Amino acid sequence: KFGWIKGVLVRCMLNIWGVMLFIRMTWIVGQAGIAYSCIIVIMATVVTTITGCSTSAIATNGFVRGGGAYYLISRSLGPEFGGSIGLIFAFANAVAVAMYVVGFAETVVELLMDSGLLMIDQTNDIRVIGTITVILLLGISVAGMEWEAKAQIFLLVILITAIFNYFIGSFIAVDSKKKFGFFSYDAGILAENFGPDFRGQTFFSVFSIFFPAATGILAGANISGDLADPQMAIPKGTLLAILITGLVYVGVAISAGACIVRDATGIESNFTLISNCTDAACKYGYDFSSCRPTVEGEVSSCKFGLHNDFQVMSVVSGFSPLISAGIFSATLSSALASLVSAPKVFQALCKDNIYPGIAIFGKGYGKNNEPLRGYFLTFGIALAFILIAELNVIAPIISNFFLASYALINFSVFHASLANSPGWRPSFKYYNMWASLAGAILCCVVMFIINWWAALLTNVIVLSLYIYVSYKKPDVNWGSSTQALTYHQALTHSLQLCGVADHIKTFRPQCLVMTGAPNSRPAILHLVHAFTKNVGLMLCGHVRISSRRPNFKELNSDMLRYQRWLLNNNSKAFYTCVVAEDLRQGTQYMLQAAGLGRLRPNTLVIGFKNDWRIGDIKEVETYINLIHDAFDFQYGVVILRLREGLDISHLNVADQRLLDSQQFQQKQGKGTVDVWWLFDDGGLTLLIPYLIANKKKWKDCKIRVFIGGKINRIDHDRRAMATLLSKFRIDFSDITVLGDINTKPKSEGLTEFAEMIEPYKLREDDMEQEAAEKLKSEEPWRITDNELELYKAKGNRQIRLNELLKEHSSTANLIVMSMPLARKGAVSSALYMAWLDTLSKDLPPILLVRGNHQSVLTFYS
């Protein structure tokens, strides 16, 4: 658990200081000037400072523990950005391994050719030595990670003594080091090297070789689970290492340009002052002409100086072979820090199953779950690029991919500050979103100036990887590590949904379904899944009827189990379990306390209870008063009834019930639905069949809108209903008007209905009313104003509508029927249940429905 120095600053300084510090800093002052190379260093420092502020803005957005480089970006921002940043950054480190070990092998090859050892040609010995040192770094990565955390301060004190040896060796004018270039600090060599030469390169061709010397700044953010306090450790160490390394780069460029000439023959001259005919700032007796190129379209056939030999810092240095062999400390550290950092990002990326096929590079073998397949993939990508045994073609690829990664980071923090992402509050003092936009545009434009077709390929790939993660299914076991953003999104969307204008008032029918346990009664789940499918809100209520000692402990586990079952099938429904001693006071909990904000259930849809006369006659009072508790909260009451019941508890008629309970989700809609618009203030009675008719399962549904009308004028009433049907855009005009209602209600069925309520001539479980009978009357069966004195017409109309249902709606899928409402108290519950059961005697799957008559058709605008 390191501090900020040993955990961030030392790692970032060892990662930044790499190949170009000793190998290629003098060549950059050779090609460009001192002024242009300083402009190059300031440009790279601006890019990496803006990216350091964006990384510090990410690192201070909470989310400390269980960190890394992929983790912070993927948790603060979305998966769509973080997956592409992880892939591009992993590939950038994988290709950078090759660059660092190619620089190491080139240094070893030139030190070998300074002796007599030479096996094959020069460009093949780099492949041999680079292959040998990449199979040796992989073994250190997969077998020796323990000593590496102690070795890094030793590598840093080798490297800083190398830098100090070069810087104090420049001040010592040696006459033996003349003819290799390197006179003392002179004004003539300062003025001569002020201004570009560009002997085969250009600006933005020299810059693309420098820019790998500025990368490696995310080596402090690559350990957030090994830091003490990351929100203080990362912005100090990263933004201080950038300053220190950039200042050392500026000092090396200015010091190399002011003491070494651009070309030099390695032959000493006896003169101390040359003959006065050259004036090329070499007044120490060296004539360095006939070493510059003749034409302006070729490289020089010289061998020393700033342009030619690539190793002049070992000449300038006070002690060459051992202190300025900190190149072996600079390259081999950085390559190693890029060999352990690409499979880390790629294994954290393959544990969230964002991209489909790459998920086999996450199985970490061993005790630490080190990704060995990721190490072998990184070894393959590095060894493919090693065989291009030339630094000046590998380095622009590294610059392209790291510039793409840094532009993605800056654009992602800009876009998250712009969009007001819900979990995005970057408490960092020097973060600005417009600076991040400027840095992203700068990296993208420079990436196109360096090479336009490589940049176009990279941007097309990143755009494809963004659009793929945007439009892909949000189901479970897909990227489930990123979960804390979904909570804040679901909270802020509901917080915006609760606040709208007070004069819009869209209807959007919500519904709670008294279904019991959701694995039981599946037909009502499929039928209230038919309508309110990405249209409204569905809700499954379940009242547990345990009276004494309710098992409050196992309610949460059973709720989570039932919700996981309901999510494992196709359903857009939530689940609410309450616990009471009966059904009515149990559903009183969910009538007036369900939902949050505007996601409250509007209508109540229940099933019909067929077993009301078979046994337990008490609970009928719990069932009708429920409806009388549903009509008082201005809800909508929907009753569903099949030919047989829905309560499934598991042979011939049992299989008939089990097959009728799943008659919707698997079958089709061959056969017409038909509504019966009888009440004018129904409302929802027409919204329901239009919603259930526009579905995949329902195509062959001719909505036969029936309406009881005036008997005198049967001509224009159907036109006045047809314009309302055109207003509701249900798009059918098969309207049939009836006039034979309440005429002669089939007295042989009147004798069936009168013998139905014959044991209930005194009302059901009304012990107060029954004991209040005896204080006025002795014969009990004389109160009939409640029962049949004032409501002959209601019962006659109910049985007449039953006969019309049997006649006109013989073959049908559903029947949307307006539900008869009677005022409570004056009408008993048993009489009302008798009317509802005689209205829907042995029909097809009818649907009694009565709305709140507040306002409809505000839906669909």
Next chain:
Amino acid sequence: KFGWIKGVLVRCMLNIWGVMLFIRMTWIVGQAGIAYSCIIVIMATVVTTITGCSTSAIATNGFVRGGGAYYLISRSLGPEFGGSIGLIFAFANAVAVAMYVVGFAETVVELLMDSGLLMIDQTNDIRVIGTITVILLLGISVAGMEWEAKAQIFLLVILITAIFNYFIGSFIAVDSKKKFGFFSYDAGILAENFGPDFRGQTFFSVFSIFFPAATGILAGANISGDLADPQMAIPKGTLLAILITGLVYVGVAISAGACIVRDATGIESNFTLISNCTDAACKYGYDFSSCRPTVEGEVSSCKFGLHNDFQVMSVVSGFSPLISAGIFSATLSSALASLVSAPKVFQALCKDNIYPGIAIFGKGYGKNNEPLRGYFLTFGIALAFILIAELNVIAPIISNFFLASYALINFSVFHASLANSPGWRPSFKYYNMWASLAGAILCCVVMFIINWWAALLTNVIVLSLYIYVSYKKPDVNWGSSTQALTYHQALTHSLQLCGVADHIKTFRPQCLVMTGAPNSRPAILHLVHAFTKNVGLMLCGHVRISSRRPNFKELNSDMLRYQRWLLNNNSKAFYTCVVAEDLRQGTQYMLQAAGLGRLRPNTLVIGFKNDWRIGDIKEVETYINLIHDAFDFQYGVVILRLREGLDISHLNVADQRLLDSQQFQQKQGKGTVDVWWLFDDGGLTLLIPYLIANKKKWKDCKIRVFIGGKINRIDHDRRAMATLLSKFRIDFSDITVLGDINTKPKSEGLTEFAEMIEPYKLREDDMEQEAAEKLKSEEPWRITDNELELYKAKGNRQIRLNELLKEHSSTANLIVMSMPLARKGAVSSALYMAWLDTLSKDLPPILLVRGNHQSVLTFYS
């Protein structure tokens, strides 16, 4: 209301056939070969066929009436794509006007220099004549648009007779048309021109000049409000005009390549067979050497042939000066068709206030609301480009902008097919989304090959115009981005949150705050808004205690009032109003029914009942049994108490009530917040002060921990406290272990605690208890096992903890103390209140808190 021919096909063939048909088709066979130019025409036909299928997918998305070109795109797709397509297409037609009139002016200048009329140099006469003909087309556009609808069939029959004149003039071998090239159809000239020459150009530099001759296909879709049946007229006419014009281009290229030589001196030769030393296919006695260029880096110094003269189709034609000078019919139509079409799209774009400043270019003067400021802007953008009086530099700009517009159309229909947009069902037979994606990628890649920095500028501008309209104040032509998209996103994110893995299980505390009316008790709003902000979920509850006949009618008005009252302040809380007979059952309504899915309240926070000794002891049973009902559902319980009141019933004592009822939103913190960790399995007791301490108000507040224990090891248990505090992310060393609990409970304070319960000494506000003790024994004060026998040490512990709180916590902002829990049934409710009120007598704003010991510290991972 035209048919498909006269309204789509004639318009598209007049817009497509333009400059390059007669001026620059033969030069394209001059630079490239016949094979490469045929490849060029087939590639342009592929791009325009894919874009025509995308336009026909857009045009068949319903939406017949109220047409246009911006309207169809902006209404089928979104405004973000439609605004950028409208802007880029308007700019492309505005710059295309200049290309067509520059071709016209160049033709008139060459016809003038064939005579003796020559005012200034050649490149200035084009500027003069082009300026004169653009100030004349503008007057026709703003004053003579009626005759143009009749003139177009006359223009087309001029143009087709020009094409037929050229094609029948090729078959007539004239010996006078020799020496300007043009032998008959020969096999030697066909074999000589099969293969590129590229005398100063490249492939994709010749394609970029051809591709403006394939554009113009959106001239049929640009009039959809003047069309009879657009879903038949637009694909038929567009996809037939593309085939006709491409076949004519292929025919012109093949015919011109096989009868004219590339270079020719305009001098006749007396010979009929050349001397047998050349063999360069001119065996008709013409030595056409000494016009081929010497080096491979210059143009030929010749004057005729395919490479040089640009007007060789007037030489091949049978009647030159009148029929094949139907270039005046080809250019001046197309320019006019691009002068009436850029202000049209730019005025339809500026009537939707999408982009801010451009809204003044929409005020249409006159009767038809013709956009005159748009006409003047198009005139200015054209006239700035006519001053570059060269066709071969104007034409790649037109190619880049039209390729950008076609790529935007193709990508937009692919993105609308991919995302399943709500109103996107393109009933067209030959639409495929992957063909559109291929066309978009092809147009983008070709746009980058032609000129990479112009393409990069165009893509940056189009991306900026997309991201601007994506994130804006919503002012769309409809309100589907206000109520529909918000509901869909909120419901699908609630369903996404409710379905996750069962083993993640973060805590993320949600709170049921009992405030009553939210304009009352604002201190509890500010306190449980301090924590559970940007972390959890706040759910303010209000019970209505209306017993007799509760109102349910206008309670929706009260809920919509108080929700807007919450949202007008900076609060993120939801509101739930229930109605019961007392507060306990009303809170029990919200304990098991509030929230949906995973957004249910886990904790319950109430305010302490200050006036419980004054009157109405019968409701204290409703307060304590609420707490015992809160602990039954495994809820955490937080109780807030102030020394003064909490609610606001609206002189100077009321002032100190009101000024301390709002003591959190306008004050700050400079000092300490102290906790009293006294229970092992609390967990939330430390989670709450860490959450309230990380706030902008509570920045200067140090957390001080108090803890009981033993006396032998007081430096040992604070280490065990410090490691779990480091596990709880506070890490404060102000943990002072005390050893004064249940030791010596300060006998002078026992008198007030004894006299407080003195009217309750065996009167615990229960009728059943008094009824049991009136017949069990004869004295009242009998069952005192709960009163003093079994719970003496508990009451002495509370009465000692109060004095410890007064000693060590006299001046503090917040006091977070653990709450004593007793077992119900045995311990009286009045005894429970006697324990709770003694703990918080004259204290700062204390906070009693007891967790549910389920799982904490899974928060922050």
